[PDB]
Design a protein around this ligand. Structure first.
Ligand code: HEC
Ligand code: HEC
Ligand code: HEC
Ligand code: HEC
Ligand code: HEC
Ligand code: HEC
Ligand code: HEC
Ligand code: HEC
Ligand code: HEC
Length: 292
């Protein structure tokens, strides 16, 4: 009913609104964001990582929709989503919501294998992971949020209602995907690659099964399939790599590797990203035995 209190004295969960000084009477905006401060302060040790000026104050006090001098005119949009934040010579380097989450996927071995070969779509479901407010908020409450006159008890009630109705999407079972796949499209100098498809997916999922960040953004049941089966609709039976990646040079599609290179770059890309000890990329027979 009431969320767990924070040690910091920040609200446990917080509705964040599109704060600006230009009137916005029709509520032309994204859904507000309910930020779970409790979860974040328990995992991120230093308050100042986020509150980069040292002030434990709402970001929008300086970073408004239009920008303003207190935030060096860096807007709300930039503060919350920036991904190319320069390192600061002196003092703190700010983080945004998106940049820290990205750092998680690059710097953590259990994430960095898949995320070395994923190009995130960042579609509406990605936005909605944060832009996630309860349907109960009214347009009048939105206006007050924007204008800064929403009562703190109203903000917390909206935040708690939102948090308590949140549900994590369960990833499909690896049992609904092939056990092994005999990858023989190109077989010539080597035997087919007997790819341990289910072993792979099962191992990758086990290492992230309780991770709250992953759970939130991996938000379609078949989404982890797209790690490898990219650029096609989510499906239990996606098209073969070689439907899109030709065996030979395809000058009409210079961004697409040919099929051998497609396998190598994807399989080896993940192996390198999560520091897989065997097979090394220089080992030419562990993924496929030499042909007689
Ligand atoms: C969490 C990691 C976020 C993701 C993913 C996206 N947004 Fe976001 N956005 C976030 C916050 C914390 C805020 C501030 C609170 C608010 O709702 O204003 C924002 C703000 C915006 C804005 C500016 C305000 C507005 O005009 O409503 C825009 C235009 C915006 N966000 C757009 C947007 C889109 C289109 C996204 C998916 C491509 C998206 N955001 C993702 C946090 C997060
Ligand atoms: C990033 C992962 C954060 C960490 C770590 C901490 N805080 Fe935080 N805090 C963060 C956000 C995105 C927000 C919401 C701002 C909004 O627009 O509503 C907050 C909010 C607070 C507040 C409320 C401030 C206000 O509304 O004026 C306080 C008092 C606060 N945070 C304190 C605080 C402390 C002491 C922390 C370390 C123990 C801490 N925060 C960590 C993001 C993050
Ligand atoms: C005024 C007291 C601020 C508050 C509160 C927050 N930020 Fe801020 N931020 C402020 C300034 C003056 C600057 C420029 C600092 C510099 O060294 O240049 C910034 C910058 C950022 C950035 C970097 C943008 C970029 O480099 O393109 C981000 C991502 C950012 N701020 C985020 C941010 C968040 C998430 C805040 C609440 C947790 C927040 N800032 C508060 C001023 C102030
Ligand atoms: C690193 C300095 C972070 C910043 C800045 C923000 N987030 Fe984050 N987030 C971070 C971690 C390490 C985690 C997982 C915590 C755990 O217990 O494992 C998360 C998680 C989320 C989630 C999912 C859980 C939840 O709160 O519902 C979301 C939707 C999320 N983060 C949103 C979010 C927003 C809106 C932020 C900017 C206002 C933001 N995060 C900053 C690390 C960091
Ligand atoms: C392969 C089995 C994965 C593992 C292990 C992890 N992630 Fe993942 N992630 C994967 C896919 C296929 C996608 C979809 C990309 C898209 O947007 O279409 C994602 C998405 C995310 C996101 C959202 C995209 C982004 O902001 O970069 C986040 C924040 C995310 N994943 C986090 C995350 C973390 C923290 C992980 C380790 C605990 C992790 N993922 C593992 C595939 C896979
Ligand atoms: C990379 C780590 C993968 C993940 C995650 C998933 N699959 Fe996969 N799958 C992968 C490869 C390299 C291949 C070979 C494709 C080729 O054209 O050579 C496959 C194959 C399949 C197939 C076809 C099997 C066949 O007999 O031809 C299916 C039906 C399939 N994959 C389904 C699938 C699903 C549903 C996934 C998520 C649960 C999934 N795969 C993940 C690589 C990877
Ligand atoms: C068409 C529906 C595709 C299927 C099926 C697969 N891939 Fe793909 N891939 C496709 C495009 C359009 C592109 C080019 C993207 C660009 O930057 O222009 C790619 C690219 C790759 C790459 C290069 C790195 C990357 O951008 O991801 C690799 C390593 C790759 N594709 C491998 C690959 C494999 C092994 C597939 C079967 C599991 C596969 N692709 C399917 C389009 C399509
Ligand atoms: C991450 C998204 C991966 C992709 C893409 C591929 N592999 Fe992989 N592989 C991965 C890990 C993390 C490991 C270590 C074992 C574990 O799960 O902890 C492996 C290991 C292998 C091995 C060794 C033994 C085995 O488990 O089968 C082989 C021969 C192997 N991988 C082959 C392989 C091929 C042929 C791939 C593309 C079709 C491929 N891997 C992709 C992680 C990932
Ligand atoms: C797994 C991580 C691999 C490693 C390491 C290497 N190769 Fe590979 N290669 C892999 C796959 C999944 C495939 C497709 C197999 C098929 O028959 O469709 C391939 C394919 C080739 C091919 C073309 C097929 C053939 O001639 O049999 C060649 C010539 C090839 N690979 C060469 C090669 C060499 C020399 C490697 C060590 C540097 C090497 N591969 C590593 C997966 C993997």
């Amino acid at each position: 009913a009431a969320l767990e209190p924070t040690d910091s004295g920040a609200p446990s969960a917080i509705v964040m609104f599109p704060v600006g000084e230009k009137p916005n009477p029709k509520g032309a905006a994204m859904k507000p964001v309910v930020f779970n401060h409790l979860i974040h302060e328990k995992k991120i040790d230093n308050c100042e990582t986020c509150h980069h000026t040292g002030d434990p104050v709402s970001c929008s006090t300086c970073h408004t929709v239009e920008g303003k001098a207190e935030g060096n005119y860096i807007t709300l949009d930039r503060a919350m989503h920036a991904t190319n934040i320069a390192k600061r010579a002196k003092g703190n380097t700010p983080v945004s919501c998106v940049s820290c989450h990205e750092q998680q996927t690059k710097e953590r071995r259990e994430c960095a294998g898949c995320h070395a070969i994923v190009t995130p779509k960042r579609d509406e479901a990605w936005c909605a992971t944060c832009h996630n407010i309860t349907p109960s908020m009214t347009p009048e409450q939105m206006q007050k949020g924007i204008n800064g006159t929403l009562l703190p008890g109203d903000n917390e009630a909206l935040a708690a209602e939102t948090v308590l109705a949140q549900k994590t999407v369960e990833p499909v079972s690896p049992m609904l995907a092939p056990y092994k796949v005999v990858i023989d499209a190109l077989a010539d100098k080597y035997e087919p690659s007997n790819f341990t498809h289910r072993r792979h997916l099962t191992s990758l999922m086990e290492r992230i099964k309780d991770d709250k960040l992953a759970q939130a953004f991996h938000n379609k049941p078949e989404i982890l399939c797209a790690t490898c089966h990219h650029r096609s609709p989510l499906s239990l039976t996606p098209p073969k790599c070689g439907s899109c990646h030709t065996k030979e040079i395809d000058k009409a599609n210079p961004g697409r590797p040919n099929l051998m290179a497609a396998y190598h770059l994807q399989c080896m890309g993940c192996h390198k990203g999560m520091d897989v000890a065997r097979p090394r990329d220089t080992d030419c027979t562990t993924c496929h035995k030499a042909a007689p």
